[PDB]
Amino acid sequence: SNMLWALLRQYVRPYRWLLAVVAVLQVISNMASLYLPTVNAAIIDDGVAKGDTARIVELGAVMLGVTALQVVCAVGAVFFGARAATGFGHDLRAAVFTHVTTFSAEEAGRFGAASLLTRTTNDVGHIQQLVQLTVTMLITAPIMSIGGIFMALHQDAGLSWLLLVSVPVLGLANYWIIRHLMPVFTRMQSLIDGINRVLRDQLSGIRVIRAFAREPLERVRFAEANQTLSDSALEAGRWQALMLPVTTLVINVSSVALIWFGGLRIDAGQMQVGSLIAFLAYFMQILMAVLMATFMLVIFPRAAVCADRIGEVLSTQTAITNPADPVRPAAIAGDIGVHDATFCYPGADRPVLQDVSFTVPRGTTTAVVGSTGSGKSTLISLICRLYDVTSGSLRIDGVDVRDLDIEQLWSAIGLVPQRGYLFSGTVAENLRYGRADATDDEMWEALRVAAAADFVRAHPQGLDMPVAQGGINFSGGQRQRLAIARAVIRRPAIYLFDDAFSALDVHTDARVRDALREVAADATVVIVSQRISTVIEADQVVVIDDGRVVGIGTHDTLLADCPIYAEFAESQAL
Amino acid sequence: LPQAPLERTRDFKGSAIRLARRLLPQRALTLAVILLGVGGIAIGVIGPRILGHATDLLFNGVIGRELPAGLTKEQAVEAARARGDGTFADLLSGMDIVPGQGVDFGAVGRTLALALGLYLVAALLVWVQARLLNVTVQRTMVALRAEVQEKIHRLPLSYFDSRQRGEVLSRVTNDVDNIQNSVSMTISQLLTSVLTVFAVLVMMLTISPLLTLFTVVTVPASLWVTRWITRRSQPLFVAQWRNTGRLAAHLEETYSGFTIVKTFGHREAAAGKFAELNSETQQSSFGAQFFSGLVSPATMFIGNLSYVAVAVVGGLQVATGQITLGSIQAFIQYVRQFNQPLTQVAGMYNTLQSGIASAERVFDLLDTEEESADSPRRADVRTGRVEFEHVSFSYVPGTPVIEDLSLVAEPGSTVAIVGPTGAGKTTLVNLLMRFYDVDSGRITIDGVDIASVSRESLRASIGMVLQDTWLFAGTIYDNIAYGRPDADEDEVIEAATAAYVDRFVHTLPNGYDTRVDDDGGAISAGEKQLITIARAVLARPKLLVLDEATSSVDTRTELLIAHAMAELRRDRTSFIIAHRLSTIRDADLILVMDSGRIIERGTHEELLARHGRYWEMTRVHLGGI
Ligand SMILES: Nc1ncnc2c1ncn2[C@@H]1O[C@H](COP(=O)(O)OP(=O)(O)NP(=O)(O)O)[C@@H](O)[C@H]1O
Ligand SMILES: Nc1ncnc2c1ncn2[C@@H]1O[C@H](COP(=O)(O)OP(=O)(O)NP(=O)(O)O)[C@@H](O)[C@H]1O
Ligand SMILES: [Mg+2]
Ligand SMILES: [Mg+2]
């Protein structure tokens, strides 16, 4: 298509003198391979035919030199064709990852964490393999098909018209085949991954499948896809089965016509009988190279859709940027203020938040409450500027967030998101995200607080106990409990808890929420709280409700005034 | 191009025999493929001999025209020898020339006609062979995938836990493709290639054994070079694959935990680690693929050396009169054809080993012991009275989980199970669904036992709500309709409204067409649980069990859900498991359970009366410690 060529011209430009060297090396190698029949014909007509026996043994040296050049010009070509393709893939992968790392939460969520990994890992490999078997297999045809004709002119111009008749007809008969094979091949490719995703969904949700007794219809829906894939494969194979026999038939018919029209000339003496072997080998090599090059031509669209995805990833411009010359407040102390903020997610006609306005002074705890979907997590993200408020103000320590060093805001914001993610490695490595240089006496204290000490201390490896790819070895309530520890080890000026207290039994939840209420005695803490009994000690309470705030105050004042807070208290009374 | 490093097979030949027997039904089709291949290869190898005879006739006529007429061959040779050019006389000696006569074009034409007819038949048989081979391969693959499916649906629920994070996934998706490639190759390319070698060797033996020696000596040399290249590149393929997997894991961790990386200031460290890992994988890929691509030129060099030797020695022989010129043209074509399979013998070996080792894994999966055969009884739960009788269960032999408990769920009553983490609540309700088998107890639903009941008919009337919510990569409407696929677009929306999904559906741009995945789409976990609740309530159950259904849902929307479903779950029992004390309230039969046993039971008032466990728990839940 169009995006693919753009990619190429941008990301193979650093390797032009390697492509230009491969193109020359494979020209020399192909010419050497085609020249062996020429010197064989020279042996036949200047040797055996004339009776000279020393001419054959002296042309054997030329043959040996040609075949010695042909191997070095091929092993030098495969070296540079690899050094160029791997470099191109490496550069493309680095560029894609660098562009992705600049995305904010919204841009990253638009594509999805799973889809971006495929974009940066498999759709770059597809273009890399296209490059490799283009620089090593596609271009074999334009030099073979041209040099063969050139050598035919150099040998016997009066009969070379056979190469100008047979090569175009084979090319046309193969193009007509591939132009029909390509769409069904793409359909088969789009069915293979469909059945793969069907199997993946069946295996992932096996408990769900068995709990709903959907096996009898799951079998039907898998069979109706397997049969469709088989039918598409048969349709694509009944076209592919014509590629080789047609080429062989063309080669053999060309050989027969060559022998006939060559005997016609040799009887008249216009050509020596030795050139028949050379022409036979020319036909075989040229028409084999053409077919082998058209074999790779099937997957252009497969590498074109991948290039389109990569280009759409690379064309997205991040919105949340770092302001030029940001104000640098030394020793940033947590003091938050939200003035008439509103987010209004892309996908508008309903702003998630509207006219939100409150203040959290330093060392005071503010707890936000609201029903599911109210926008508490959106408010938390806005506080740390994962997103940006569209028509409001959000100022930490007086200065607006929008004009402030984003890394300095990152360094002292103590975020514990709702999700909960633990990176691969050891528990100590995960806890080192907060403080890069943390002692074991400090890690155990930070660990201890989150009440997570006595499930890793009972491990044989202690602090170095392994962690899965995404903390999947944990059960939930241990992963998001370690998430609390990795942020409490930071000792930040701001804590931002996003309801990581779920999946915890009563005793552990109480222990954690009482222990972290002590270490955060002097710190700006914003906690997404759900249990009203855990909000009495909070200095301020915010009453988000499906959009804006519907109440601000302490426990008693909000119970007296706010009716939704009263509803929450009544409903979780007993 | 093959790049799979290697695999170890427990028994190569037994697995190969089993894989061959897999395609046993197509015995007639396989035999037809083999015979067509043999016929086509014979006709394709006999043609160059006909072309050699044609050019031999051309040569005889051309160089017999110049000789004086009248004289016969054996005296013309003597006359040429007496002329001093003895080598030309030797050339004339081994020939079929009649002096004074030119080329007979009629014989040449009627020989080329036979050659053309044979080539037409050869080029017509190969296409039919390939078309039949495609059908055979597709039929066998369809059968294998269907039986793999069946085995997957028959496997025990404990096999998927022992297997390590995607082993089963990579055993059926990308492991059957290797079998397909190996099967479609071992009868389409390897067979032709060995038959090509055999037929070519036969024909060149009929032409000249001495020339056959020079071109058969290269097979050991080419094989030695090929296996040396593969042996030296074996440490490279493993390194490339390991580095690729490591880079993919790092990229997945960076993308999934992107918020943590950005927030904790590790973006510039993740970028550095990527810049140090991608550089390593580039080297390990370039080095692994240079050697992989070095195979073809290496064997082509040996083939060209054989070609040079054959050409020189054949020219010497023909100039001496040992063999005819057409016989050396045919030999040149034969050696050119014979050199071909030696180039990708490495390819067939690699794609055969990688794929026989895959068939071994697939057969091992298909040979695992499955679930016990469920007795067809068509469970008839009317009221929903559940009873546990001395139920004991252990996930593995040894350490037990559930130890001799007995609960009685009366019809209509809503039993609520509470306890600390790791008590086994989820296990307790999984035993009710026959996910696992009770060791030394008995579960009775409405009097009848649960073992002598059709497992599907039992699980189709419980409508269980998971603890760890799962949604497939589809739309919200599809996820809700996943319960009953045969429900019109008026009950799915009613269930969504009952579960209050249609309260935040009206917030998204495209409400019911929103593509949602299990890895954090535009839907939060609390809203995600509502989709599961709606899906479970759409497929009308007879007794509900909800394991942490509303863990992430506030205690103001769950009250609305309870009020909306009060009529649905009015005469149906319900086992509610929740760590939140405000959900089990107004629900009789509260079971406090610890370490797999049940400490105490009764309603809320009775439990509060006898201070202990529950009491202490409810004091801890509220203000206190
Ligand atoms: N990427 C998005 N596109 C469109 N709508 C979105 C997106 N992300 C969130 N929303 C909506 O924005 C609203 C606020 O979501 P959210 O802030 O997660 O609620 P919440 O405070 O987290 N309640 P809870 O689910 O209990 O955590 C909801 O109606 C969401 O459906
Ligand atoms: N697949 C399994 N294999 C082995 N042991 C298991 C398995 N699943 C659970 N267990 C163990 O069984 C015990 C209780 O399991 P579980 O059913 O998760 O209790 P639970 O009450 O659901 N915990 P929770 O849901 O977080 O409150 C623990 O000791 C677990 O380690
Ligand atoms: Mg949220
Ligand atoms: Mg559980």
Short mmCIF file of N, CA, C and O in Angstrom, two decimals, chain A residues 406-490:
data_model
loop_
_atom_site.label_atom_id
_atom_site.label_comp_id
_atom_site.label_asym_id
_atom_site.label_seq_id
_atom_site.Cartn_x
_atom_site.Cartn_y
_atom_site.Cartn_z
N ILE A 406 6.77 17.48 35.10
CA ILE A 406 5.96 16.29 35.34
C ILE A 406 6.72 15.26 36.16
O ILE A 406 6.12 14.54 36.97
N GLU A 407 8.04 15.17 35.99
CA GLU A 407 8.81 14.19 36.75
C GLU A 407 8.87 14.55 38.23
O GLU A 407 8.80 13.65 39.08
N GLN A 408 8.99 15.83 38.55
CA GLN A 408 8.96 16.24 39.95
C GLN A 408 7.62 15.93 40.59
O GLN A 408 7.56 15.51 41.75
N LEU A 409 6.52 16.14 39.85
CA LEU A 409 5.21 15.73 40.34
C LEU A 409 5.13 14.22 40.53
O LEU A 409 4.51 13.75 41.49
N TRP A 410 5.73 13.46 39.61
CA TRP A 410 5.76 12.01 39.76
C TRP A 410 6.48 11.59 41.03
O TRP A 410 6.03 10.67 41.73
N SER A 411 7.60 12.24 41.34
CA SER A 411 8.51 11.77 42.38
C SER A 411 7.90 11.80 43.78
O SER A 411 8.38 11.06 44.65
N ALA A 412 6.88 12.62 44.03
CA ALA A 412 6.36 12.80 45.38
C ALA A 412 4.83 12.80 45.38
O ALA A 412 4.19 13.72 45.87
N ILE A 413 4.23 11.75 44.82
CA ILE A 413 2.78 11.69 44.67
C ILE A 413 2.17 10.41 45.21
O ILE A 413 0.94 10.29 45.24
N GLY A 414 2.97 9.45 45.67
CA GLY A 414 2.54 8.21 46.28
C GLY A 414 1.30 7.53 45.73
O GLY A 414 0.31 7.40 46.45
N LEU A 415 1.31 7.11 44.47
CA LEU A 415 0.11 6.60 43.83
C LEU A 415 -0.05 5.10 44.08
O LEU A 415 0.89 4.33 43.89
N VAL A 416 -1.24 4.71 44.52
CA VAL A 416 -1.63 3.30 44.64
C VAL A 416 -2.89 3.11 43.81
O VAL A 416 -4.01 3.29 44.33
N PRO A 417 -2.77 2.75 42.54
CA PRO A 417 -3.95 2.70 41.66
C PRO A 417 -4.86 1.53 42.01
O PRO A 417 -4.52 0.62 42.76
N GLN A 418 -6.07 1.59 41.43
CA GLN A 418 -7.05 0.54 41.64
C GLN A 418 -6.59 -0.78 41.04
O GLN A 418 -6.86 -1.86 41.59
N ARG A 419 -5.88 -0.72 39.91
CA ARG A 419 -5.51 -1.92 39.17
C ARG A 419 -4.61 -2.86 39.97
O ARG A 419 -5.03 -3.96 40.34
N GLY A 420 -3.39 -2.43 40.24
CA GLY A 420 -2.45 -3.26 40.96
C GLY A 420 -1.58 -4.07 40.01
O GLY A 420 -2.06 -5.04 39.42
N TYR A 421 -0.32 -3.68 39.85
CA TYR A 421 0.59 -4.36 38.93
C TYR A 421 1.94 -4.53 39.60
O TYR A 421 2.49 -3.57 40.15
N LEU A 422 2.49 -5.74 39.53
CA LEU A 422 3.80 -6.05 40.06
C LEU A 422 4.68 -6.58 38.94
O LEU A 422 4.29 -7.53 38.24
N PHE A 423 5.86 -5.99 38.77
CA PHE A 423 6.75 -6.37 37.69
C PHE A 423 7.52 -7.64 38.05
O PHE A 423 7.64 -8.02 39.22
N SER A 424 8.03 -8.30 37.02
CA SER A 424 8.76 -9.55 37.21
C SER A 424 10.06 -9.30 37.96
O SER A 424 10.67 -8.23 37.88
N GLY A 425 10.49 -10.32 38.70
CA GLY A 425 11.69 -10.22 39.51
C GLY A 425 11.44 -10.67 40.94
O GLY A 425 10.72 -11.65 41.17
N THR A 426 12.02 -9.96 41.90
CA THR A 426 11.84 -10.27 43.31
C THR A 426 10.97 -9.20 43.96
O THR A 426 10.74 -8.13 43.41
N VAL A 427 10.49 -9.53 45.17
CA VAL A 427 9.71 -8.56 45.94
C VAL A 427 10.55 -7.33 46.25
O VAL A 427 10.05 -6.20 46.23
N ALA A 428 11.84 -7.53 46.53
CA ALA A 428 12.72 -6.40 46.79
C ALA A 428 12.82 -5.49 45.58
O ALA A 428 12.81 -4.26 45.72
N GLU A 429 12.93 -6.07 44.38
CA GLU A 429 13.01 -5.25 43.17
C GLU A 429 11.74 -4.43 42.98
O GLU A 429 11.80 -3.25 42.61
N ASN A 430 10.57 -5.03 43.22
CA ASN A 430 9.32 -4.29 43.11
C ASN A 430 9.25 -3.17 44.14
O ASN A 430 8.80 -2.07 43.84
N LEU A 431 9.70 -3.45 45.37
CA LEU A 431 9.70 -2.42 46.41
C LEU A 431 10.72 -1.33 46.15
O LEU A 431 10.58 -0.22 46.69
N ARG A 432 11.74 -1.60 45.34
CA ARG A 432 12.75 -0.60 45.02
C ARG A 432 12.24 0.47 44.07
O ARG A 432 12.96 1.45 43.82
N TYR A 433 11.04 0.31 43.51
CA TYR A 433 10.48 1.35 42.65
C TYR A 433 10.25 2.64 43.44
O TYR A 433 10.49 3.74 42.92
N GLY A 434 9.79 2.52 44.68
CA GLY A 434 9.60 3.68 45.53
C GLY A 434 10.91 4.39 45.83
O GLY A 434 11.09 5.55 45.45
N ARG A 435 11.82 3.70 46.50
CA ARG A 435 13.15 4.21 46.79
C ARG A 435 14.17 3.34 46.07
O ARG A 435 14.19 2.12 46.26
N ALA A 436 15.02 3.97 45.25
CA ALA A 436 16.02 3.21 44.51
C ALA A 436 17.07 2.60 45.43
O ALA A 436 17.66 1.57 45.09
N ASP A 437 17.31 3.22 46.59
CA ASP A 437 18.28 2.73 47.57
C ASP A 437 17.55 2.58 48.90
O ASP A 437 17.52 3.51 49.71
N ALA A 438 16.97 1.41 49.12
CA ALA A 438 16.23 1.11 50.34
C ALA A 438 16.89 -0.04 51.08
O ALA A 438 17.20 -1.08 50.48
N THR A 439 17.11 0.14 52.37
CA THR A 439 17.71 -0.88 53.20
C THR A 439 16.68 -1.93 53.60
O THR A 439 15.47 -1.69 53.59
N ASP A 440 17.18 -3.12 53.96
CA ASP A 440 16.29 -4.19 54.38
C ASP A 440 15.55 -3.82 55.66
O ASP A 440 14.38 -4.16 55.83
N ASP A 441 16.22 -3.12 56.58
CA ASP A 441 15.56 -2.65 57.78
C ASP A 441 14.43 -1.67 57.47
O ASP A 441 13.47 -1.59 58.25
N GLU A 442 14.52 -0.95 56.36
CA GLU A 442 13.46 -0.05 55.92
C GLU A 442 12.41 -0.76 55.07
O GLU A 442 11.22 -0.46 55.19
N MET A 443 12.84 -1.69 54.22
CA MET A 443 11.89 -2.48 53.44
C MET A 443 10.98 -3.32 54.33
O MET A 443 9.78 -3.39 54.07
N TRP A 444 11.53 -3.94 55.37
CA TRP A 444 10.70 -4.73 56.27
C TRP A 444 9.71 -3.86 57.03
O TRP A 444 8.57 -4.27 57.27
N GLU A 445 10.12 -2.65 57.41
CA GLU A 445 9.18 -1.73 58.06
C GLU A 445 8.06 -1.32 57.11
O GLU A 445 6.88 -1.39 57.46
N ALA A 446 8.41 -0.91 55.89
CA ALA A 446 7.41 -0.55 54.90
C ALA A 446 6.52 -1.72 54.50
O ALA A 446 5.40 -1.50 54.03
N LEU A 447 7.12 -2.89 54.52
CA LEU A 447 6.43 -4.09 54.16
C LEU A 447 5.53 -4.38 55.30
O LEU A 447 4.36 -4.64 55.15
N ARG A 448 6.09 -4.29 56.49
CA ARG A 448 5.37 -4.57 57.70
C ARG A 448 4.10 -3.77 57.83
O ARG A 448 3.10 -4.33 58.23
N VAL A 449 4.15 -2.49 57.52
CA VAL A 449 2.99 -1.64 57.62
C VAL A 449 1.87 -2.20 56.82
O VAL A 449 0.83 -2.52 57.33
N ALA A 450 2.10 -2.38 55.54
CA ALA A 450 1.01 -2.89 54.72
C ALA A 450 0.55 -4.28 55.13
O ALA A 450 -0.20 -4.91 54.38
N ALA A 451 1.01 -4.78 56.28
CA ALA A 451 0.66 -6.11 56.78
C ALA A 451 1.04 -7.21 55.80
O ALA A 451 0.53 -8.33 55.88
N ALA A 452 1.94 -6.91 54.87
CA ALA A 452 2.41 -7.87 53.88
C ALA A 452 3.71 -8.54 54.29
O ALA A 452 4.26 -9.32 53.51
N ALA A 453 4.22 -8.24 55.49
CA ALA A 453 5.49 -8.82 55.92
C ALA A 453 5.36 -10.32 56.16
O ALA A 453 6.24 -11.09 55.77
N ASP A 454 4.28 -10.74 56.81
CA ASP A 454 4.14 -12.15 57.19
C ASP A 454 3.38 -12.95 56.14
O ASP A 454 2.51 -13.76 56.45
N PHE A 455 3.73 -12.74 54.87
CA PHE A 455 3.54 -13.75 53.84
C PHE A 455 4.72 -13.82 52.90
O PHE A 455 4.75 -14.70 52.03
N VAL A 456 5.71 -12.94 53.05
CA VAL A 456 6.98 -13.07 52.36
C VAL A 456 8.11 -13.43 53.32
O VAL A 456 9.14 -13.95 52.87
N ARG A 457 7.95 -13.18 54.62
CA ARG A 457 8.93 -13.64 55.60
C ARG A 457 8.82 -15.14 55.82
O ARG A 457 9.81 -15.78 56.20
N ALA A 458 7.64 -15.71 55.60
CA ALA A 458 7.43 -17.15 55.68
C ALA A 458 7.85 -17.87 54.40
O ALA A 458 7.59 -19.07 54.26
N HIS A 459 8.49 -17.16 53.48
CA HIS A 459 9.01 -17.72 52.24
C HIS A 459 10.48 -18.07 52.39
O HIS A 459 11.22 -17.35 53.08
N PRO A 460 10.93 -19.18 51.79
CA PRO A 460 12.34 -19.57 51.97
C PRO A 460 13.33 -18.52 51.50
O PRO A 460 14.40 -18.37 52.11
N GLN A 461 13.02 -17.79 50.43
CA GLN A 461 13.92 -16.78 49.90
C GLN A 461 13.80 -15.43 50.59
O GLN A 461 14.61 -14.54 50.33
N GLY A 462 12.81 -15.26 51.47
CA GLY A 462 12.67 -14.00 52.17
C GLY A 462 12.35 -12.86 51.23
O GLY A 462 11.45 -12.94 50.39
N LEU A 463 13.11 -11.77 51.37
CA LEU A 463 12.87 -10.58 50.56
C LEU A 463 13.12 -10.82 49.07
O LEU A 463 12.60 -10.06 48.25
N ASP A 464 13.90 -11.84 48.72
CA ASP A 464 14.23 -12.11 47.33
C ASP A 464 13.30 -13.13 46.69
O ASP A 464 13.68 -13.76 45.70
N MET A 465 12.10 -13.30 47.22
CA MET A 465 11.20 -14.32 46.71
C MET A 465 10.72 -13.91 45.32
O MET A 465 10.41 -12.74 45.10
N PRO A 466 10.66 -14.84 44.36
CA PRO A 466 10.37 -14.46 42.98
C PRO A 466 8.95 -13.92 42.82
O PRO A 466 8.03 -14.30 43.54
N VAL A 467 8.79 -13.03 41.84
CA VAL A 467 7.50 -12.46 41.47
C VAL A 467 7.23 -12.81 40.02
O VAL A 467 8.14 -12.80 39.18
N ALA A 468 5.97 -13.13 39.71
CA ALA A 468 5.60 -13.58 38.38
C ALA A 468 5.65 -12.41 37.40
O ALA A 468 6.07 -11.30 37.72
N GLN A 469 5.22 -12.67 36.16
CA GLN A 469 5.31 -11.66 35.10
C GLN A 469 4.53 -10.41 35.46
O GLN A 469 5.03 -9.28 35.31
N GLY A 470 3.31 -10.57 35.95
CA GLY A 470 2.51 -9.45 36.38
C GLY A 470 2.02 -9.62 37.80
O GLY A 470 0.91 -9.20 38.14
N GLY A 471 2.84 -10.24 38.64
CA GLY A 471 2.40 -10.60 39.97
C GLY A 471 1.28 -11.61 39.97
O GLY A 471 0.41 -11.57 40.85
N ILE A 472 1.27 -12.52 39.00
CA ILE A 472 0.16 -13.46 38.87
C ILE A 472 0.28 -14.63 39.83
O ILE A 472 -0.71 -15.34 40.06
N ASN A 473 1.47 -14.86 40.40
CA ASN A 473 1.60 -15.91 41.41
C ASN A 473 0.84 -15.56 42.68
O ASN A 473 0.52 -16.45 43.48
N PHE A 474 0.55 -14.28 42.89
CA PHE A 474 -0.23 -13.85 44.04
C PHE A 474 -1.71 -14.13 43.79
O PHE A 474 -2.14 -14.44 42.68
N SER A 475 -2.50 -14.02 44.86
CA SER A 475 -3.90 -14.39 44.82
C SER A 475 -4.84 -13.20 44.64
O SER A 475 -6.04 -13.42 44.45
N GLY A 476 -4.34 -11.98 44.69
CA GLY A 476 -5.22 -10.83 44.75
C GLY A 476 -5.51 -10.51 46.20
O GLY A 476 -5.99 -11.36 46.94
N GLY A 477 -5.20 -9.28 46.62
CA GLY A 477 -5.13 -8.96 48.02
C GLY A 477 -3.75 -9.11 48.62
O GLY A 477 -3.49 -8.57 49.70
N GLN A 478 -2.88 -9.86 47.96
CA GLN A 478 -1.44 -9.84 48.22
C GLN A 478 -0.71 -8.98 47.21
O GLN A 478 0.19 -8.22 47.58
N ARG A 479 -1.10 -9.05 45.94
CA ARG A 479 -0.52 -8.19 44.91
C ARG A 479 -0.81 -6.72 45.20
O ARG A 479 0.12 -5.90 45.25
N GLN A 480 -2.07 -6.38 45.42
CA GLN A 480 -2.43 -5.00 45.72
C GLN A 480 -2.09 -4.60 47.15
O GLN A 480 -2.20 -3.42 47.49
N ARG A 481 -1.69 -5.56 47.99
CA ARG A 481 -1.12 -5.21 49.29
C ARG A 481 0.36 -4.87 49.17
O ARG A 481 0.84 -3.96 49.86
N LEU A 482 1.08 -5.58 48.31
CA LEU A 482 2.45 -5.20 47.98
C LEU A 482 2.49 -3.87 47.24
O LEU A 482 3.47 -3.13 47.34
N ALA A 483 1.45 -3.58 46.46
CA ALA A 483 1.36 -2.28 45.80
C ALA A 483 1.32 -1.15 46.81
O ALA A 483 1.93 -0.10 46.60
N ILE A 484 0.61 -1.34 47.92
CA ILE A 484 0.60 -0.34 48.99
C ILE A 484 1.98 -0.20 49.61
O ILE A 484 2.41 0.92 49.94
N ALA A 485 2.68 -1.31 49.81
CA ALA A 485 4.00 -1.26 50.43
C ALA A 485 5.00 -0.52 49.54
O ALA A 485 5.82 0.26 50.03
N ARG A 486 4.95 -0.77 48.23
CA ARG A 486 5.89 -0.13 47.32
C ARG A 486 5.68 1.37 47.23
O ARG A 486 6.59 2.07 46.77
N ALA A 487 4.53 1.88 47.64
CA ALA A 487 4.30 3.32 47.68
C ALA A 487 4.55 3.90 49.06
O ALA A 487 4.99 5.05 49.17
N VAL A 488 4.26 3.14 50.12
CA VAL A 488 4.57 3.62 51.47
C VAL A 488 6.07 3.62 51.72
O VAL A 488 6.54 4.36 52.60
N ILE A 489 6.84 2.82 50.98
CA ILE A 489 8.29 2.88 51.10
C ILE A 489 8.85 4.16 50.50
O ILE A 489 9.98 4.55 50.81
N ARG A 490 8.08 4.83 49.64
CA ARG A 490 8.55 6.07 49.02
C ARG A 490 8.63 7.21 50.02
O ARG A 490 9.43 8.13 49.85
#
